[PDB]
Structures are given as C-alpha cells and as structure tokens.
Amino acid sequence: RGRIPGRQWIGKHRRPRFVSLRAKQNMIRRLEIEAENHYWLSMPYMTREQERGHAAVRRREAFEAIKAAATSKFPPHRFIADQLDHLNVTKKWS
Amino acid sequence: MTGKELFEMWKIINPMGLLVEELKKRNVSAPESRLTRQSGGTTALPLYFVGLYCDKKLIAEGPGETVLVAEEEAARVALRKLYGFTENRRPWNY
Amino acid sequence: SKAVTRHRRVMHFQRQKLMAVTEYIPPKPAIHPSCLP
Amino acid sequence: QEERERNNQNPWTFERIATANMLGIRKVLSPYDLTHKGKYWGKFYMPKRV
Amino acid sequence: ADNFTLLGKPLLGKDLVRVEATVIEKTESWPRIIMRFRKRKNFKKKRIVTTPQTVLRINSIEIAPCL
Amino acid sequence: TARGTPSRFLASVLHNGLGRYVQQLQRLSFSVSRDGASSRGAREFVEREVIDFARRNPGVVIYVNSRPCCVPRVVAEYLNGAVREESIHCKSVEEISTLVQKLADQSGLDVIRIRKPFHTDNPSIQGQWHPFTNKPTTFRGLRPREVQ
Amino acid sequence: AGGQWRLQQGLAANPSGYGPLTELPDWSYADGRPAPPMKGQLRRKAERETFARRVVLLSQEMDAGLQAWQLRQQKLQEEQRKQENA
Amino acid sequence: KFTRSRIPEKVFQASPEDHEKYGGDPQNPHKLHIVTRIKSTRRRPYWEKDIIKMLGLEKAHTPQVHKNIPSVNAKLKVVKHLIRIKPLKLPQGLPAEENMSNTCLKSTGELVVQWHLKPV
Amino acid sequence: VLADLAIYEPKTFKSLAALASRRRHEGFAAALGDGKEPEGIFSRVVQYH
Amino acid sequence: SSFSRAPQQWATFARIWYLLDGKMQPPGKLAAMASIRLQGLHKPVYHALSDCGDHVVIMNTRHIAFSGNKWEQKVYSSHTGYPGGFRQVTAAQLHLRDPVAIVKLAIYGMLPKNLHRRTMMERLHLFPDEYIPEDILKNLVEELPQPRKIPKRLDEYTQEEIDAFPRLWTPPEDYRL
RNA sequence: CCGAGCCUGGUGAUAGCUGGUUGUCCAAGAUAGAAUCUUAGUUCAACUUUAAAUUUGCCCACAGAACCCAAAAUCCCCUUGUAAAUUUAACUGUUAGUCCAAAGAGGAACAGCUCUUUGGACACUAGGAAAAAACCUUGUAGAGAGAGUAAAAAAUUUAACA
Ligand SMILES: [Mg+2]
Ligand SMILES: [Mg+2]
Ligand SMILES: [Mg+2]
Ligand SMILES: [Mg+2]
Ligand SMILES: [Mg+2]
Ligand SMILES: [Mg+2]
Ligand SMILES: [Mg+2]
Ligand SMILES: [Mg+2]
Ligand SMILES: [Mg+2]
Ligand SMILES: [Mg+2]
Ligand SMILES: [Mg+2]
Ligand SMILES: [Mg+2]
Ligand SMILES: [Mg+2]
Ligand SMILES: [Mg+2]
Ligand SMILES: [Zn+2]
C-alpha cells in the first residue's frame, strides 16, 4: 500500500520531497558566503585604463617560451655506448 | 622475562596462608575477606569482588568466579603489591 | 511536461529549498502588543 | 503586500537571489521568473509569497 | 602515570619528557591486491603492492622535574 | 588475501629491541653461474659490492657456490631456522643491493597479514576497565530493594 | 570537529594543515642531532615560496601599471601645455 | 532556456552597513584576492568549468591569488557561486628575499613572512 | 587513543571528562557575558607564531 | 591492575543485572535505554561478535503511560498466517490481554535485526507487578533511574509549597462558584 | 520430414540479420547534419586518435549588428587570466540515445508520450535521498587502526452564541 505511480521521482506524479532546517541552514550559509564574495568583488583597486597594458610583456614572453618548447621536437641522440652495452650480455669469467 | 609475571613464573599453594605469614612477620593485624561487590550469585556465572581489609583498611581486592577464587586472587594481588612486582612497576633500566 | 498545468507542477528540489527559505518573517516585538502596552 | 515586502525580516529574497544568480539556480528557474519571481508558479498565484 | 597525567596545549615541551625508540625491523608489507572490475564492459584490472613498513620498540621514557 | 592467507600478531624474536640489537640475518647462500646472461648481474654484484657488504656486516656469513645455473638464486637462513630463497634471475646490481639489504634488515619470520600494527605486553595502567570502576557502592552493600 | 572554532580563533580548521602538530620534526637522533626534513614539509615550504614569489610579482606588476598610467597622464598634461604653447 | 547570465552592475555597490560589516574601507582598497574552490564544478556549464581551469582552481581547498582588477573580477563574478573569496592582509609588508621560504598563510587571509613556529 | 584510554585507564578519561565539563560551564558563563568579564581559565588559548 | 589473566578477563566481560521501574514512564524511553544496555553499547569494550550484553529487569510494566491518545489510535497489527488472519489491536486491548507485550515489542523494534536480538530479548526480563522471584531479585546489582519525572498531584503538594506560591488574582465576592 | 524428391559437385553459395571473438599493464576518447529503392545500412561532414610544422587559440571592453512587428541572450571584441589552437600525412570507430531544468510545437495545457533549441547528467568511481540511471554533493585514481567537511532526517489539526 502507498505505492507511487511509475518511477518514484519523475512524471506527472512523483514522490514528494520536503525540506529540513538542516538544508535550510546549509544553503543560507552558502548565501552569506556569496554575499561576502559580492562585497569583496566590489571596490576594485585599479581602473580599466590603468590596468590595460601592464601584463602584455609577461603574456607574450610566456607564449614565445611555449613556441620554443613546441618547436623543439626532434628524435633523440643515438650513442655507441648504449649501442654496444648490449654486447655485455655474453659476459663470462675466464 | 618481561612478559611472564611473578605467579606465572613461580607457583604457590595456600597464597592466603603465605600472605598471613608475610604480614604477621611485618607485624600488622590479620585481615578479613569481605565481598565488596557481587553479581549473579544465583546465576550460572557468579562474580565476586572480595577485598582483604586489615584494621579497617584495604590492601587488595580480587575478582573471581566464586568467593574462594576471589579471596585467593585478592591475596595474590596483595602479595604482588607487597613484593613490588605489580604490573604498574618501574620498567627495567638499560 | 509543460510549464503551465492544471495541477500544481512539482518544482525542483533546489527551487523548493529557496521557496522554503524565502518567506515573510513578521517583525514582532519581544512583548505581545496587548498585555503590556 | 507592499508593507510586508518592506518589513520582512528574512534577509534573503528571491528578488536578490535570482537577480544575482547566487547559486546557479538559474538552471531550475526561468527567465520569466525574473519578473514572476516568487508569487507565480505556472498559472497559479501565491499571494502570501513575498 | 598511575596517579597523575600531564597533557599539553596541544603538545608538551621538549625538555619535560624524553621518549626513546629503537629500530628493529625493515620489511616490505605482505602483498596487497588491488582489483578493479566493472560490469559487462570487460573492465577488469589488477595490481600488486608491497608497501614498506618499519618496526620500532619504545625502550624507555623519563620525565624532567622542570615544570 | 586475509581470509585465505594466515595471520599473526606483531612480535619480535627474543625481545630484540630492548637489549643489544642483533640483525637476525644469519646466513646467505649464492648460486651463480660462470656463464649465463642471467647471472651477469650477480657476477658484478659479487665482484664489487659483496666485499663491502660483508665488511659492513660481520655477523652475517656468506656462502657462494659458483656452479652452473640457468637461474641464479640467493637463499637466506635466519636465526629461527627460517629459510627463504629468491631468484636473482636477470636483475640489476642496484636492485640486487636493495634486495640483500632488505633481507639483512628483515626479521626471522614469514611476511603475512599483521592483525595489529602494535604490541604491548602490559597495556593497562590505572587498571583495566571492569563494569564496576565508574559506579559507587551502597551503604552496607545493599542491592536495590533489599531490606536487610 | 571544531573547524569553525579553530578558524575564528586563527588556527587551521584541520589541525593537520599547519601548526606545530605537523610542521615540527617527528623524529630525531637520541644524541640530539637534527633529522633531515620530511618530503611533505619540503613540498609545503616550496609551495609557500612559489606563493610568495607570485604575490610579490603580482603586487609589483600592479604598482608598475599604476606608475606607468600616472606617468602617461603627466605626459598628457605636458603635451597639452605644448599644444597651447604652440 | 539556460544561458550565460548577465549580472546587474548595481549589485556590486556596497552600502555603509556592508562596509562596516565586512570591515572593508572603500578607500585604500586591497590589491589581491585569495580564492578557494568550494563547490562542485560538475553539474555546471562548460564555460564555468573552463573559467575554473584557467584561474587554476581545478583543485579544491587550495588557495590561489589573483589581482583586484575588473578584467579578473568578470571571471570571478561568473564563477562567484563556486568559490570563497577573501582579501589579502599582511602586517609585515611585502615578503623580503631572505624570508621567501619561511612564509605561512592563515585562515584569516593573512600571509606572515616570518614563521618562528613557537608560542609567545 | 581516546577509546584505548577510556578502556585501560578510566581515571585519565574521567579527568578528560571533568576538563570538558568545566569548559562547558566556562562556555556558558561566556554565553551569559562574552566580554566585559575575565575569560575562562581553561578557555584561554595559546598564540603561536 | 596487577590482576590475573582469566579473572581479569572474567571481570571485564562479565554480565550485570540492571533494574528499572516503569511506573508512569514511557515504554519508548525505558526500552531504548534497556536495548542499548542489552546489546552493551554502554561499556567501552562493545563489539557485536563479543556477546557483552547484560541482563535487564523492568518493574511495573502494567503501570506505564503513553503520551497522547496512543492507547486508542496506536495499532499493533499482526497476521497469524491464514486467510483473514490479519488482526489489529489497540495498545489498550493488547495491554489488557498481555501487559508485557508492549514493552517487549518496543525493545524488539529498538534492537538491531541480527540473530542476537532473540538472545538479548531472553536476557531481558519483565514483570507487570511489584513482585519478583527469589533468585532474580537476589542476583541484582543496580537500579538505574527513570527517564522522565512524575508530576505531583494536589494531594501530594505540601502546604508550605502552596502558601509560598503566590495567589494571582482577587475574585469578586458576588459569584456563586 | 514434397508448393515439389534424394545424393554428389559448383560451395568455404550469399546473408546490411543474430551469435562468438583467447595474455598483462598506461593513456586519450561517447557530439551538429547532408545524401542514399535510404532510415536494421553506408559515403561525406562533424567528433575523437596518432606523428609532425606553425602561431595564435579560449575567457573577452567601449563601440558596432533593420524597418517590419515588449525577453533571457547572441555575434564580433582589444586588454586580462591562462595554454592551447590551426595547418600538414594517415586511418579507424560513433552516425538506432534516456532523464531533469528552461523557451516552445503536437496531443487532453495526459502520458515513464512524441518532436526542436540551451545546459547538465547518465551510458566512469564514490556519499546521500528507502531500495533507485537521468535528482543533490563530488572527480584523476595507491597503503593507513589519522583528522576537517560537502549534499544530507518535514512541518501540519479547522469553525458555538446574544
Ligand atoms: Mg517506477
Ligand atoms: Mg520540458
Ligand atoms: Mg524442398
Ligand atoms: Mg521424401
Ligand atoms: Mg558466409
Ligand atoms: Mg543492414
Ligand atoms: Mg551478437
Ligand atoms: Mg583515462
Ligand atoms: Mg541539399
Ligand atoms: Mg579576441
Ligand atoms: Mg529507434
Ligand atoms: Mg521519452
Ligand atoms: Mg515523455
Ligand atoms: Mg552506446
Ligand atoms: Zn499577556
């Protein structure tokens, strides 16, 4: 007795969820945090025109470092030492 | 030896009599055994806490299945306390 | 389903939390306005 | 209704919460709610809601 | 001790106590198995780990009269 | 696995930590081959590192057979008579060194599930808990609803 | 437990975060010698050092931007002076 | 339908009660926002999560610094509900080179340049 | 360790419980008067740097 | 300690016979405390596998009181097993037929649903009246207190309390009453 | 065992259709539509993958984008915060999709109904809502006999009258 038509959480008839002081206090806490975020986002330090052209140097020098890193792609170097160390598998005492 | 305790290493008979002899040598009154606490006396699992009191002063208490086991265990406890081999004694210095 | 319905369309859980948080909390004095004043 | 919406002690009102999108609840909400804020749900009308 | 205890806020001073411990044993832990299996997606995977583990013995404790 | 595998409580031999410590590795037995690509690591280890290892550890004893073996072995006998053998087949010198050192640092008992990471042979001070520690007594020790 | 209390007191919400409970060395030689740092402490102090370098970088970049702006405004003023002097 | 939500700029004008509540003087505004990620980036739009990734908040409960400038405040506004913001405060002035290493953060947004690790 | 203490040395756990209760009572006195009073002796905290 | 091994183990894992009086107390609360003590949460050595329970005794189960009209609207329902064997009975009728079954079912519900439930319920003991068999009022240890308080009656309130409590208003003389 | 016998051979007939598809381990990775005797399929596109060359790629700041007949928003977009993006050689696989929230169309302002758009989730782990795909918290992977937190438990009782 007391079944829910179809699935318990969807459709024209679903299971009625209800709210508790637990969830209420949780979300109002989050809302107060969001209010503090709004406050601290207000009162900026500098203006658009003041902050326009200070970081271009750093940005483009970082990007040209990325350029160099991406361009520097070649096969590794090959060595006779690593080539001949394979001969040392047949080592044996006299 | 650290683990194996005194009465586990060395065996005794009539420990109550041994205790009597000991504290008579130490010149103190002959104590009486009195059940301090009881539980399940009629139950199949009797439990007695017997204290050995001299001159209205307690030296040791002992748990036990029966009153005899409780009083002999209290005698054992008092003997340990007098000989200084209590489990809470100073560890061995190295 | 549609937004507008004959029956009361059950709302989302977050929405119901918000609607349960937002109500008229009547400003009442600590003293009832009849017995003391 | 005006004096109730002026004198409500609850600091949190769907007006502010939705116009700011304080918790991304614009998912569950509609653009219509921005003006049908709390009083309306579908065609219905909740006058006690403030 | 049997009759008293000393607890810090949060921890005790260095000069008050001296806890000494000796190393006795270094080992690799016994082979622990990590199997991940999911259903009807041929997702079956295993790995063996032998974490290192060290054994100490507390040899002596002494307290200082400083207080 | 725990239920399939046996278990033990943490313990040490003859109380090794209290008195003078003794590394409970006793004996090593190497089985290495003159030839064999698998035993080249063991040959390098015995030619250079084993000298310094034996110098650092005098209490241990080392035996080397140097016989034909398709897979080189190392056997370790500890104080209790615990024998454990492991294959050094095709192993590098550094991992051989780490292996022999962990053998030296191990104790004389099989690795199995340890039920508890501690061991106190006298855990209780102020007395072990019994039901009557934290409840008072009665005048003349009278049970509830008892006249005399 | 007590995270918000610790926060309002000034300490870490989780005592394992920072403070003497975690930052101090957990073992030293019986002869009184200092043990080497733990890898956790090393990475923590490295993170903090990068953090400080970054903060200094950001602060001095903002200061340089404001300085350049005000210098450009002085440039503007003096070039207006030039214009009307012409 | 659900789209990127424009915020009314009137929201970001603090009142005197708000100033004296949060302890922030409109004059002499701070320079740096310490930021932490508090909310799930899942069940959020791709643009929000990409802004998270570019600000460097893919890791939660890990403080990261940004400037106080509108170019950044835009991103912070659009991902404000996912993060805890606080200003930076320091009594000991900018960290000196000798004390780059022995720095320490506090729960109160403070950055102490010296950390003696010892009670008064 | 709290459980091990409560098991093997109930006296120390009883001392801890007494400490906690006294701190509760100090917190109640503070709830009565937050400031304008001498703070609790055990409610006092250590400042580290 | 300085106790022997087997006696110490015995004294630690021993059972205890607790007693509580249910006269004008709620079955819910008294059964809750009895249940926690039956499975043995009260002792710090609690573990399910270790049968560390204790024996409990309730007294005057007949003289219990609910809060509200539960005597009327609470329905204990059970199916015998046959067609039409679905029976429902109010707490009042079930009390009249068996004054113990209420507290019994209460504890049976409070307890966990393990096989230890039956063992704990037979550890427990119940008596509707102020009367107990010799052994099972002899081998007791302690009588723990009641969960709620008993409000006093006017016949119980002494005179000094009455004359200390101030009178609130002055009635007009011209009134029949 | 005849809608046309049985045997052999072609014949390993063909089968867009069902089924099955063998050792260990790491990573990246479900995706608009068009055409088709085509809608149980396939080619292209798009997505994804690999190895290379190159440089701008993403977020975006004022300005800017219609008369006809009052929306959330969108396009473009320097700075800034970040590190990816495009192109070149090579294929394969996906191309039968479900719920929720929102703007709508059909229907009964029915459907766990069907059809488009924006987003999320699921088809990847975990905790919770009773068990629960799609609801809410939450990701980058281990040992722990350490700790702080996230979402997270429903409240209701009703009517006298001169
Ligand atoms: Mg269903
Ligand atoms: Mg819809
Ligand atoms: Mg035929
Ligand atoms: Mg035929
Ligand atoms: Mg075929
Ligand atoms: Mg086909
Ligand atoms: Mg198939
Ligand atoms: Mg992967
Ligand atoms: Mg066409
Ligand atoms: Mg651009
Ligand atoms: Mg289909
Ligand atoms: Mg459908
Ligand atoms: Mg449908
Ligand atoms: Mg699929
Ligand atoms: Zn009144």
PDB file of N, CA and C in Angstrom, chain F residues 121 124-132 135 142-145, chain J residues 1 8 11-12 16 18-19 21 43-44 59 138 140-141 143:
ATOM      1  N   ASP F 121      52.824  -5.812  25.743  1.00  0.00           N
ATOM      2  CA  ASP F 121      52.662  -6.991  26.580  1.00  0.00           C
ATOM      3  C   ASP F 121      52.137  -6.651  27.967  1.00  0.00           C
ATOM      4  N   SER F 124      47.916  -2.117  30.264  1.00  0.00           N
ATOM      5  CA  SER F 124      46.998  -1.460  31.180  1.00  0.00           C
ATOM      6  C   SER F 124      47.756  -0.771  32.303  1.00  0.00           C
ATOM      7  N   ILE F 125      47.436   0.501  32.513  1.00  0.00           N
ATOM      8  CA  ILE F 125      47.816   1.248  33.700  1.00  0.00           C
ATOM      9  C   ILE F 125      46.552   1.916  34.213  1.00  0.00           C
ATOM     10  N   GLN F 126      46.519   2.187  35.514  1.00  0.00           N
ATOM     11  CA  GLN F 126      45.320   2.620  36.223  1.00  0.00           C
ATOM     12  C   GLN F 126      44.256   1.534  36.247  1.00  0.00           C
ATOM     13  N   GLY F 127      44.602   0.311  35.866  1.00  0.00           N
ATOM     14  CA  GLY F 127      43.663  -0.788  35.905  1.00  0.00           C
ATOM     15  C   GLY F 127      42.791  -0.904  34.674  1.00  0.00           C
ATOM     16  N   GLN F 128      42.653  -2.126  34.170  1.00  0.00           N
ATOM     17  CA  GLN F 128      41.800  -2.381  33.023  1.00  0.00           C
ATOM     18  C   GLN F 128      40.337  -2.180  33.395  1.00  0.00           C
ATOM     19  N   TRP F 129      39.547  -1.757  32.413  1.00  0.00           N
ATOM     20  CA  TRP F 129      38.154  -1.430  32.673  1.00  0.00           C
ATOM     21  C   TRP F 129      37.382  -2.672  33.087  1.00  0.00           C
ATOM     22  N   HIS F 130      36.642  -2.558  34.177  1.00  0.00           N
ATOM     23  CA  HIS F 130      35.620  -3.519  34.545  1.00  0.00           C
ATOM     24  C   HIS F 130      34.336  -2.758  34.829  1.00  0.00           C
ATOM     25  N   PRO F 131      33.191  -3.436  34.778  1.00  0.00           N
ATOM     26  CA  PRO F 131      31.911  -2.719  34.858  1.00  0.00           C
ATOM     27  C   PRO F 131      31.741  -1.889  36.115  1.00  0.00           C
ATOM     28  N   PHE F 132      32.467  -2.188  37.187  1.00  0.00           N
ATOM     29  CA  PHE F 132      32.250  -1.542  38.472  1.00  0.00           C
ATOM     30  C   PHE F 132      33.235  -0.416  38.752  1.00  0.00           C
ATOM     31  N   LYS F 135      31.094   3.251  39.008  1.00  0.00           N
ATOM     32  CA  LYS F 135      29.851   3.341  39.754  1.00  0.00           C
ATOM     33  C   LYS F 135      30.125   3.137  41.235  1.00  0.00           C
ATOM     34  N   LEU F 142      24.092  -2.875  49.909  1.00  0.00           N
ATOM     35  CA  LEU F 142      22.726  -3.367  49.800  1.00  0.00           C
ATOM     36  C   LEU F 142      22.273  -3.273  48.353  1.00  0.00           C
ATOM     37  N   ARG F 143      21.858  -4.406  47.794  1.00  0.00           N
ATOM     38  CA  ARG F 143      21.272  -4.412  46.471  1.00  0.00           C
ATOM     39  C   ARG F 143      19.966  -3.622  46.479  1.00  0.00           C
ATOM     40  N   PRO F 144      19.531  -3.138  45.318  1.00  0.00           N
ATOM     41  CA  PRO F 144      18.277  -2.381  45.269  1.00  0.00           C
ATOM     42  C   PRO F 144      17.096  -3.228  45.715  1.00  0.00           C
ATOM     43  N   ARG F 145      16.202  -2.604  46.478  1.00  0.00           N
ATOM     44  CA  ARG F 145      15.016  -3.269  47.014  1.00  0.00           C
ATOM     45  C   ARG F 145      15.418  -4.481  47.856  1.00  0.00           C
TER      46      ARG F 145
ATOM     47  N   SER J   1      46.358  -2.387  37.987  1.00  0.00           N
ATOM     48  CA  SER J   1      45.624  -3.644  37.921  1.00  0.00           C
ATOM     49  C   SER J   1      46.290  -4.710  38.780  1.00  0.00           C
ATOM     50  N   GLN J   8      40.767 -11.344  35.351  1.00  0.00           N
ATOM     51  CA  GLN J   8      40.600 -10.011  34.784  1.00  0.00           C
ATOM     52  C   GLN J   8      39.674 -10.051  33.580  1.00  0.00           C
ATOM     53  N   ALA J  11      36.106 -10.513  34.890  1.00  0.00           N
ATOM     54  CA  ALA J  11      35.537  -9.314  35.485  1.00  0.00           C
ATOM     55  C   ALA J  11      35.244  -8.256  34.436  1.00  0.00           C
ATOM     56  N   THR J  12      36.025  -8.222  33.358  1.00  0.00           N
ATOM     57  CA  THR J  12      35.780  -7.241  32.310  1.00  0.00           C
ATOM     58  C   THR J  12      34.555  -7.615  31.486  1.00  0.00           C
ATOM     59  N   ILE J  16      25.854  -8.009  33.978  1.00  0.00           N
ATOM     60  CA  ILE J  16      25.308  -7.293  35.121  1.00  0.00           C
ATOM     61  C   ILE J  16      23.792  -7.284  35.017  1.00  0.00           C
ATOM     62  N   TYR J  18      20.681  -5.256  35.715  1.00  0.00           N
ATOM     63  CA  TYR J  18      20.162  -3.919  35.947  1.00  0.00           C
ATOM     64  C   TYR J  18      18.659  -3.980  36.174  1.00  0.00           C
ATOM     65  N   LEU J  19      18.144  -2.995  36.904  1.00  0.00           N
ATOM     66  CA  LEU J  19      16.721  -2.916  37.195  1.00  0.00           C
ATOM     67  C   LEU J  19      16.219  -1.500  36.965  1.00  0.00           C
ATOM     68  N   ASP J  21      12.287   0.822  37.035  1.00  0.00           N
ATOM     69  CA  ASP J  21      10.868   0.847  37.365  1.00  0.00           C
ATOM     70  C   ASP J  21      10.113   1.622  36.293  1.00  0.00           C
ATOM     71  N   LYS J  43      29.148  -0.167  27.638  1.00  0.00           N
ATOM     72  CA  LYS J  43      30.513  -0.457  28.062  1.00  0.00           C
ATOM     73  C   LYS J  43      31.503  -0.168  26.934  1.00  0.00           C
ATOM     74  N   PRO J  44      32.685   0.374  27.249  1.00  0.00           N
ATOM     75  CA  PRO J  44      33.642   0.734  26.192  1.00  0.00           C
ATOM     76  C   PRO J  44      34.283  -0.440  25.478  1.00  0.00           C
ATOM     77  N   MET J  59      10.208  -3.254  35.931  1.00  0.00           N
ATOM     78  CA  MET J  59       9.273  -3.442  37.027  1.00  0.00           C
ATOM     79  C   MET J  59       8.036  -2.589  36.802  1.00  0.00           C
ATOM     80  N   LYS J 138      17.358 -11.414  43.880  1.00  0.00           N
ATOM     81  CA  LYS J 138      18.545 -11.540  44.710  1.00  0.00           C
ATOM     82  C   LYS J 138      19.809 -11.179  43.940  1.00  0.00           C
ATOM     83  N   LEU J 140      20.931  -9.184  41.790  1.00  0.00           N
ATOM     84  CA  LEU J 140      20.902  -7.879  41.149  1.00  0.00           C
ATOM     85  C   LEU J 140      22.128  -7.072  41.545  1.00  0.00           C
ATOM     86  N   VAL J 141      22.308  -5.954  40.850  1.00  0.00           N
ATOM     87  CA  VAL J 141      23.466  -5.097  41.057  1.00  0.00           C
ATOM     88  C   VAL J 141      23.011  -3.667  41.308  1.00  0.00           C
ATOM     89  N   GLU J 143      19.885  -0.375  40.324  1.00  0.00           N
ATOM     90  CA  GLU J 143      18.610   0.111  39.810  1.00  0.00           C
ATOM     91  C   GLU J 143      18.855   1.485  39.204  1.00  0.00           C
TER      92      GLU J 143
END
